[PDB]
């Protein structure tokens, strides 16, 4: 493999995180005060890493951090129930652990933590984070397995109710690649709606990594994936592979949601920077 | 594998079953008159087993027994259309067969019956069982393949419209386990709604058994599964594996649905019997 | 395998196609003028084939042809944005290529084009084809991989909003087979609703072909499949295998949708042409 690959994990990483109310009314996570995003920052790690996150709630209401997929103790589940949220102005340290797969004492196979996951608030608005999530308190988490192929860039598309990334309808987000790039997309759904994520000109494997191991990988290949609230998948694609440059559309294929604004562009450029038709 | 495993099938099993109207308005299946449950009793069998069920309808309206997954002749499909429902007070013997996998004469591969299946009414309220299903006429069916790992206990979570197991909003069901137990979940959806089943602190394989065969199983690992009417999956988890004891929440992650009551507790206890925080 | 298998692709195929406004008000694709259908004709090809489709728009409104899964350049994505639709009375040649799977230069594994795909309009009603798709501008596309088992017949079932193949509620379509026939279903969903496709007495593998490769194929076996707008899968079944002849119901298991009309019959006949109960 001429491509970069993920190393074996086992680091103890540290991370400061904030929750901020944004001037537009939204709420967002950030790694630096004043630099909060919706979606929030991407956290990326290797199976075996441990992550300590000193999370500071800079808001006037309680807020929390809840993650999918990773190992955490109940003290870190981010729920009011388990006394795990954070009061206004407070600071709590959360810990996420990840393990490699392997055989258990009983001969059964323990799955690893690798995958395309995500984190979100669990206590704003309701004890399930309905307000925090609607407001933008969600972000992606990637856990890589030793050997995983690494992309040239990672992009996060979140269908949150009937928006992408909390944007006004019909305003993207667009993003750009050059024909040939190894583009990784993290796709997360939130809210009370169901969607189908469709991408013109490109397809991927409906498995953990979006990539087939080889000739024996039985995973289906698809260009259209159904998604429900708190579902998260990812894939990698070769921008324009076999199809060339262009303004490639991505959208929710729900005809109503398409019409109502859930559309963006994957702008795959030629080596000279141009996009056929423009 | 030092865990118990399912034996080869081939038995001819007999079963008596009833449909009763319950004092609280609902309708339920049972194995003994006066002991009907919503969800109904679990039927569990091995590939190759045959099941003769003498089903007696103790209600004042036609009722039936329709099963997913297993082999049955049209006389046992449980529809009014094919004359295989049951008159009030009547008694009828349904037969379900199961088979092992193996090679067909044409060299193709016939799948076996193994899986996480279910049974429900088909003629109450409408010719599609809408009333019976609404009222509680559904139950789980497990078909095991020789060698399948057996659990310490099995639990059935049914998302029926916007309830769990037909319970009142925000009333569980909760279950208890001890850190270390092998806990099997049978998850069934019924009605006119779509859901995502989420479970804190735990994850499983999105394949037939919920378990990875080993290092080569390409099955994706998830903690959030989308489900539609009459969908049915299952899985096993090691209670608290890598995360400890606690009041672990499970719910539909549809923000509206969890707000409206669709939440339960998976109480994983320390060996002293306690649950962190209480 | 003593059943017919798909050959290696590589042909350059040519195809003429029309969009016709039908007298009942719908819009359909056809291969011959005056012989348009909803669903439109089945296009079927082998990995490596190229297909040039001279598509003539016979209607009073712009219309287009957009395909899932296969390779196409941006000049052929069928969108207004990319100047790829067809004006009334106009004629445009779209091109679809397909490729075999194989190893990329970087050691990674490029998936082939094989699958159960589909094509539909992208510019009638809205820039997402909401009108065309509503009216019936959709059809199936199969891309076979060398060695794929071929069926005795293929049938296409489209859940379009709350109809099957744009039919009036409770009017089928029905299909006939003989016990033993190898029957292929192409299942496609369009519109703004979500569905579960259920079939009595039969089951299939939730992978690309609906078939297990053999004893090592980890794919789940199911009889009930969730589906969203622009989703497309297919499978093969042996009509009546292990269950006998009969009037086998297929429907959307959404209790509301089946009550509301989304039901059809798979009439599996005895060798004497009869159907148990009639
Ligand atoms: Cu939660
Ligand atoms: Cu959508
Ligand atoms: Cu498309
Ligand atoms: Cu969540
Ligand atoms: Cu049915
Ligand atoms: Cu729900
Ligand atoms: Cu969670
Ligand atoms: Cu059913
Ligand atoms: Cu599109
Ligand atoms: Cu439906
Ligand atoms: Cu059924
Ligand atoms: Cu489409
Ligand atoms: O599309
Ligand atoms: O959650
Ligand atoms: O059914």
* Cβ contact C218:A218 at 8 Å: yes
Inter-chain touch B243–A208, beta carbons under 8 Å? no
Tokens representing C272 are: 């004497």
Q: Does B274 touch chain C (CB under 8 A)?
A: no
Residues 6+ apart with CB under 8 A from C21: C27, C58, C59, C60
Burial tier of C135 (Cβ tally within 10 Å: 0-12, 13-18, 19+): buried
Q: Alpha-carbon Rg of chain A, whole angstroms?
A: 19
Query: Under a CB-based contact definition with an 8 Å cutoff, are residues C77 and C66 in contact?
Result: yes
CB count in 10 Å sphere of residue B38:
22
Cα–Cα dist A45/A151, whole Å: 14
- For residues B143 and B117, what is the distance between their CA atoms, to the nearest angstrom? 8
Alpha helical stretches, state H, chain A: 130-135, 255-260
d(CA B257, CA A23): 30
**What Å distances lie between residue A91 and A11, A57, A75, B208, C171, CA to CA?**
23, 6, 14, 42, 62
Whole-angstrom Cα distance, residue C65 to residue C54?
11
CA within 13 Å, CB half, C193 = 20
Residues in chain B: 278
CA B14 to chain centre: 20
As given in the structure block, the two tokens for residue C182 are: 């190898």
Nearest CA in chain A to C72: A243
Cis peptide before C143 (omega within 30 of 0): no
Note whether A120 and A133 are within 8 A (CB): yes
Please tell me whether C66 is known to bind a ligand.
Answer: yes
Chain C interface, best mutation among B75, B104, B108, by max C CB count within 10 A = B108
**What torsion do the CA atoms of A196, A198, A203, A207 make, to the nearest 10 degrees?**
-20
Contact between B196 and A193 under an 8 Å Cβ cutoff? The reply is: no
* Residue pair A234/A209 in contact by the 8 Å Cβ criterion: yes
Beta bridge partners of A188: A158, A232
C100-107 contacts at long range (C-beta below 8 A, 24 or more positions apart): C100/C9, C100/C47, C100/C48, C100/C145, C100/C146, C101/A212, C101/A215, C101/C47, C101/C145, C103/A214, C104/A238, C105/A2, C106/A1, C106/A2, C106/A3, C107/A1, C107/A2, C107/A3
CA dist., res. A211 & res. A253, Å (int): 22
- Listed residues: CB within 5 A of ion ligand 4: A 230
Question: Torsions phi, psi of C256, nearest 5?
Answer: -65, -45
Rounded to an integer, what distance in angstroms lies between the CA atom of residue B40 and that of residue B67? Answer: 13
Secondary structure of chain C in the HEC alphabet? CCCCECCCCCCEEEEEEEEEECCCCCEEEECCCCCEECCCCCEEEECCCEEEEEEEECCCCCECCEECCCECCHHHCCCCCCCCCECCCCEEEEEEECCCCEECCCCCEECCCCEEEEEECCCCCCCCCHHHHHHCCEEEEEEECCCCECCCEEEEEEEECCEECCCCCCCCCCEEEECCCEEEEEEEEECCCCEEEEECCCCEECCCCCCCCCCCCCCCEECEEEECCCCEEEEEEECCCCCCCEEEEEEECCHHHHHCCCEEEEEEECCCCCCCCC
Contact B198 CB / ligand 14 (< 6 Å): yes
The contacts of residue A187 (CB under 8 Å, 6+ apart) are: A116, A156, A157, A158, A159, A197, A225, A227, A232, A233, A234, A235
Q: What is the distance between the alpha carbons of residues A133 and C252, in angstroms, rounded to a whole number?
A: 32
SS3 B13: strand
Residue B132 Rama label (left phi>0; alpha psi -120 to 50; beta): alpha
Give the residue from B227, B237, B180, B176 showing the smallest Cα distance to B204: B237
Breaks (C-N over 2.5 A) in chain C follow: none
The strand pair at B175-178 and B263-269 is best described as parallel
Structure tokens at B125: 């309220």
- Report the 10 Å Cβ neighbour count for B229: 29
Q: What is the CA radius of gyration of chain B?
A: 19
Contacts of B74 in chain C (CB under 8 A): 201, 243-248, 276-277
Reported resolution, Å: 2.9
Q: How far apart are CA B197 and CA A17, in angstroms?
A: 28
Distance, CA of C122 to CA of C132 (rounded, Å): 7
Q: How far apart are CA A16 and CA A33, in angstroms?
A: 10
Decide if C214 touches A, using CB distance below 8 A: no
Distance between CA atoms of residues C51 and C9, nearest Å: 11
Count CA atoms closer than 13 A to B269's CA, side-chain side. Answer: 9
Q: At residue B273, what are phi and psi to the nearest 5 degrees? A: 95, 5
Q: Tokens for C244, please give them.
A: 């006998």
Asked whether A190 lines ligand 14 (CB < 6 A), one says no
Which positions in chain C touch B95 (Cβ < 8 Å)?
none
Query: How far is the C-alpha of C178 from the C-alpha of B232, rounded, in Å?
Result: 29
DSSP line for B118-184: EEE-SSSSSTT-HHHHHHT-EEEEEEEPTTPBP-SEEEEEEEETTEETTPPTT----EEEETT-EEE
Instruction: Give the one of B130, B207, B226 whose C-beta lies nearest to C255's C-beta.
Output: B130
Of all residues in chain A, the one with the smallest CA distance to C112 is A221
Residues of chain C with CATH 2.60.40.420: 12-144, 153-269
Q: Report the half-sphere exposure of B5 (CA within 13 A, side-chain side).
A: 11
How many angstroms away from the CA of C236 is the closest CA of chain B? 11
How many Å from the N-terminal Cα to the C-terminal Cα in chain C?
36
- In whole angstroms, what is the distance from residue A260 CA to residue A161 CA? 12
- For the segment(s) B12-144, the CATH number from 3.90.180.10, 3.40.640.10, 2.60.40.420, 3.10.450.30 is 2.60.40.420
Specify the 3-state DSSP secondary structure of A130: helix
Q: B175-178 and B224-227 as β-strands: parallel, antiparallel, unpaired?
A: unpaired
Contact status of A94 with chain B (Cβ, < 8 Å): no
Which residues of A sit in the known binding site for Cu(2+)?
Answer: 66, 68, 120, 122, 195, 198, 200, 251-253, 257
Which CATH number applies to C153-269: 3.40.50.300, 2.60.200.20, 3.30.70.1230, 2.60.40.420?
2.60.40.420
Structure tokens belonging to residue B189: 């959806």
Biggest CA pair distance of chain B? 62
Neighbours of chain C (3+ CB pairs under 8 A): A, B
Cα first-last separation, chain A = 36
CB B156 within 8 A of CB B167: no
Mutation target vs A (from C188, C229, C233; most A CBs, 10 A cutoff): C229
Q: Could you tell me if A261 and A222 are in contact, meaning their C-beta atoms sit under 8 angstroms apart?
A: no
CA distance A204 to A238: 10
CA-CA distance, B173 to B167, in Å (whole number)?
A: 8
**Which of A223, A233, A245, A235 is CA-nearest to residue A177?**
A245
Instruction: Please give the radius of gyration of chain C, using alpha carbons only, rounded to the nearest integer.
Output: 19
Nearest residue of chain C to residue A195 (CA atoms): C228
Terminal C-alpha separation, chain B: 36
Beta-strand (E) ranges in B31-136?
A: 36-37, 43-46, 50-57, 66-67, 91-97, 102-103, 109-110, 115-120
Closest CA to C40 of C49, C53, C27: C27
- State how far the Cα of C133 lies from the Cα of C160, in Å rounded to an integer: 8
Residue recorded with tokens 């109502």: A260
Q: What count of other Cβ atoms lies within 10 Å of the Cβ of residue C25?
A: 8
Nearest to C149 among B79, B108, B232 (CB): B108
Are the Cβ atoms of B243 and A72 closer than 8 angstroms? yes
What are A34's two structure tokens?
Answer: 């004043």
Among residues A212, A206, A214, A200, the alpha carbon closest in space to that of A244 is found at A200
Q: If contacts are CB pairs under 8 Å, which of residues 30-69 in chain B contact chain C?
A: 66, 68-69
Task: Copy the structure tokens of residue A5.
Answer: 């690959």
Pairwise CA distance, residues C192 & B150, whole Å: 41
Distance A162 CA to ligand 2 centre (A): 6
> Is there an atom of ligand 13 within 6 Å of A155 CB?
no
Does residue B28 contact residue B136 with C-beta atoms inside 8 Å?
Answer: yes
Residue A267 to residue A165: CA distance in whole angstroms: 18
For residues A278 and C82, give the distance between their C-alpha atoms in angstroms, rounded to a whole number. 10
DSSP-assigned letter for residue A75: G
Between chain A and chain C, the number of residue pairs with CB atoms below 8 A apart is 127
Q: Is B257 helix (H, G, I), strand (E, B) or coil?
A: helix
Task: Count each helix (H run) and each strand (E run) in chain A, helices first.
Answer: 2, 22
As beta bridge partners, residue C233 has C187
Q: How far is CA C277 from the centre of its chain?
A: 31
Please give the DSSP secondary-structure letter assigned to residue A86.
B
Q: How many CB atoms lie within 10 A of CB A239?
A: 24
With b meaning 16 or more CB within 10 Å and e meaning fewer, what string describes A152-181?
bebbbbbbbbbbbbbbeeeeeeebbbbbeb
Distance CA C238, CA C177 (A): 9
Q: In chain B, what are the helix, strand and coil shares in percent, each to the nearest 5? A: 5, 40, 55
Three-state DSSP state, A133? helix
Helix (H) or strand (E) holding B255: helix B255-259
Which residues on adjacent β-strands are paired with residue C176? C267
B-C C-beta contacts closer than 8 Å? 125
Which string of DSSP letters, residue by residue, matches B220-244?
PEESEEEE-TT-EEEEEEETTTTT-
Phi-psi sector, B31: left (phi>0), alpha (psi -120 to 50), beta: alpha
d(CA A154, CA A175): 11
């Amino acid at each position: 493999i001429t491509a970069r690959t993920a190393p074996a994990g086992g680091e103890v990483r540290h991370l400061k995180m904030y929750a901020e109310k944004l001037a537009d009314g939204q709420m967002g996570y950030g790694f630096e005060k004043g630099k909060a995003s919706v979606p929030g920052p991407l956290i990326e790690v290797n199976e075996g890493d441990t992550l300590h996150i000193e999370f500071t709630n800079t808001m006037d209401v309680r807020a929390s951090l809840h993650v999918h997929g990773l190992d955490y103790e109940i003290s870190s589940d981010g729920t009011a129930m388990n006394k795990s949220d954070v009061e206004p102005g407070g600071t709590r340290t959360y810990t996420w652990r990840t393990h490699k797969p392997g055989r258990r004492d009983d001969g059964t196979w323990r799955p690893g933590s690798a995958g395309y996951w995500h984190y979100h608030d669990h206590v704003v608005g309701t004890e399930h984070g309905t307000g925090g999530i609607r407001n933008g308190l969600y972000g992606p988490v990637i856990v890589r397995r030793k050997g995983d192929v690494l992309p040239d860039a990672t992009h996060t598309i979140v269908f949150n109710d009937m928006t992408i990334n909390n944007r006004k309808p019909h305003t993207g987000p667009d993003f750009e690649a050059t024909v040939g790039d190894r583009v990784e997309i993290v796709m997360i759904t939130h809210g009370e709606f169901y969607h189908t994520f469709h991408m013109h000109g490109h397809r991927w494997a409906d498995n953990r990594t979006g990539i087939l191991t080889g000739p024996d990988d039985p995973s289906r290949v698809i260009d259209n994936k159904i998604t429900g609230p708190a579902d998260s998948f990812g894939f990698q694609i070769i921008a324009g592979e076999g199809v060339g440059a262009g303004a490639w559309m991505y959208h929710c294929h729900n005809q109503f949601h398409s019409d109502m604004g859930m559309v963006g562009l994957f702008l795959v450029k030629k080596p000279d920077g141009t996009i056929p038709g423009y």
